[model samples]
Target: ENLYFQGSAIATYNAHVYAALNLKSKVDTTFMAIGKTTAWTDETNPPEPDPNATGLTEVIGYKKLKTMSLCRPQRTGETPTLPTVSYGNKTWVLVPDAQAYTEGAKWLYCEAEFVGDELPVGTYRQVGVFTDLAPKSGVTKPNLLPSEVANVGVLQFFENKQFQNRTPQVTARERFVAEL
Candidate 1:
C-alpha cells in the first residue's frame, strides 16, 4: 500500500524494458477490488503499510479484468511503527463499478459500491487495485481470503479507511485513485 508509487513502476518498468530491448510485454489482466478482514490494533486509528510486504490483492468492488493494467505488486522494506496491514484473514470480491484509465492522465480510477443487497452485511475497511493474470470472470465471494483465482497482486493504491457499515437499507460508495 505504501509502496503504491513503486507498484505502478512495475508495469511502467516492463513497458520501458520492452520498448528499449524488444522484450516480452504481454497484456496482463488487472483488477480493482476490496477486502475487510484485515486485523488491526485499532479500527479507528489505522495501520501503516510497510514499504515492503508480501501478499494478495483483496477486493469485492473489482475492475480492469479484460484490460491491461498499471496496477502492480509491491517488491519486498522497512519496519513500521503502525503495524502490518496484512491481516491473517482474507475474504475478497469484485467491485462492479466503473473503472477508467484516461489518456494523458497517469492514473487509474476505481469505484466500488456495497449495494443494499450485495456483499455480506458487515463492516468493511480495506481497498486494493492490482493485477491478476488468470482471473475468474464475474467472480464474487465474501467468505474466503487468498480467494482469488490467481495472483500478481499489486494493490498500487491501498488505504485503511474509517470503517463503514453495510446493511439492508444502506449502500456504501467508495472511489480510489491509483496513480503512477
Candidate 2:
C-alpha cells in the first residue's frame, strides 16, 4: 500500500485558533481545506483508485496527519506572506518558491515513504492520499484540481506525467485517518 519515489498533487488548508492549548473553541471558525478534486472511489479500505471528483466533498482527516503547514487561512481575501503548517510539535514555514498545486487539490495526496526517525509510530497507518474537502461557493460537487489526482505512495502509479494535466474523479479510504 506504499508508492515509493513518486510525487502527487499536494494541496493544504490551515488556520490558527487561539485556544486552551488543545483549542476547545467556542466560536466556530469553520476550518476549510480548499483544493482540486479527483477521481477515486472513496471507500472504507486501502489501495483504491481516485476518480477525480470535480465537486468537492467533506474533509474527514486532519487530526491524523503529523505534519505542519504555513498556509494562511483563506479568509475574505486575506493572503499572508509567510504560510506555515503544523503537525505534531513541528512547524514548517511555506517556501514561497515551492510550487503551488491547484486550489481544490488540498485533499488529494500521494503518500510518501518516511525514513530515519521522522515517521511517528502511528504515522504509517495513516492514509497517504486524501482531500481537505473545501466546497465551491455555489456548486454541489467540487471542482477539484488537475493535480488532485493521486497521493503520496500512490504516485508510483502515475509516473513522469505532469500533475497539472490529469483530472479524474476519485473516492479515497476514509480509514486512512488515525485509529481515532
Candidate 3:
C-alpha cells in the first residue's frame, strides 16, 4: 500500500548513524503532513513521548522532492565490503560507508519497501525511531538537534502549520563519487 510517499536510510548527523526517513511527497498537492520521532534511552523499551527528547523532525513534503543519494565505497588498501543495516521492519543494504562523501558528507541510503498488506492511516508514529547502529569510528550515541525531541526519526501525519516556504524547480541529486 503506497498511501503516502516514504523513504528510509541511515543519516550521518553530528557524527552518528541514525535510521533516517524522508517524506518525499503526498499524492495531493494541497494536503499537508507533520511527523515526529519517539524517544528512548534503551532500544528495548518502546519509544514513547518524552519531554527530554529534542531535535528537528518535520520535513515539508510538498516543497522538496526526495532523490537517491549517489554513493561510492570508501577507499582502502583491501577490497571493501558494502555496509548493511538491520532497522525497523526491514534489512537495508548500504552502498558506501559513512565517510564516503565526495565533498560534503555520506549517509547510507536505501529504499524501505512496504511489505504489509495495508498501509494504515492515522496520527501514528514509529515505535523505535532511533537506531541502534553505532557510528563507524565512535563508541557513543549521537546527539539530537534542539528542535528535535528524540530518536523518533521523521514522522508525517495530516495537520496544519504556518511557515515561509519555497519550491525547488528541480530535485537535488546525491553525488555518486567525489573527485580526488
Candidate 4:
C-alpha cells in the first residue's frame, strides 16, 4: 500500500484544490467548520450589556480526521523527524497529520460536525460548506465526495428499470414526457 502512486491508497487531501474551492461567498451555502467559535466580549467602549452576558456560541463536539502522507518507519538510530527518500529533484516522506504543514491556512483543513438545523448538521469531513445548490425545488446537492450517498440513489435510478425501461416513443398525440 506504501508503493509510489498506490492506486488503492488514495485519500482526501485536506489542502487540495477541491478543498480550497468553496461557496462561502455565495448567499445560499455559507457553511463554516463546527469547531469555529466566537466569544461575546465586554471590552467594547460603547458596550451596554457588558461584564455580565459574556456569552459563547453553542457547544458542539466532533472527532477530527487525521491526514497523512506515505513514508517509511524510521529506525532506532534515526533522529526524530519526518524522514524522506529522494527521487529525482524532489523529496518524499510519510508524514502523518500532514495538515500540520498548513499552519496559518487552517480554514483549508477545517473539518467537524457543526450542530445546527439550518445546515446539514453532521460530519463535514473536509473544508467546505453544505449549502443547498438548489432550494425551491428541494433537491439536495451533497458534497462531491468519493463515497457520496446521495449519488447512489441517482446512480440507481439510471441503472434500474425505471430509467432503462423508458425509451423515446412517438405517440399519435404530441406530448413532452418528463421523468423525475
Best by lDDT: 1
For each candidate, what TM-score against the reference?
0.47, 0.19, 0.20, 0.17
Q: lDDT per residue, candidate 3, 1-180, as tens digits?
A: 557767896545423222221211121111112233332244344344443443224421111112223233344453435553343344333443343333222333322222122122222222112222222243232222223222233322221212222223322221111111
lDDT (0 to 1) per candidate: 0.43, 0.25, 0.27, 0.25
Where's the lowest-lDDT run of ten residues in candidate 2? Answer: 153-162
lDDT of 1 by residue, 25-113 (tens): 23234444556655456876877755454432244444443322222222234332321222224211221112112112233334445
**Arranged by TM-score, best first:** 1, 3, 2, 4
How many clashes show up per model?
A: 15, 68, 13, 2
Model 3: runs farther than 4 Å from truth?
1-51, 54-95, 98-102, 106-110, 118-128, 133-180
Worst 10 residues of 3 by lDDT: 23-32
Candidate 3 vs candidate 4, lDDT winner: 3
| Number of the top TM-score candidate | 1
Which of the two candidates, 1 or 4, achieves a greater lDDT against the reference? Answer: 1
Descending-lDDT candidate ranking = 1, 3, 4, 2
Candidate 4 lDDT over 21-124, as tens digits, reads 33212323322222112322421221231223212123122112122122332344666355454432433333333433342111222222322332323221
lDDT of 3: 0.27
Across 29-136, the per-residue lDDT of candidate 2 in tens digits comes to 111122222322432333333444332232212212223221222435545355544432433334221322322112211122222222111212222223333333
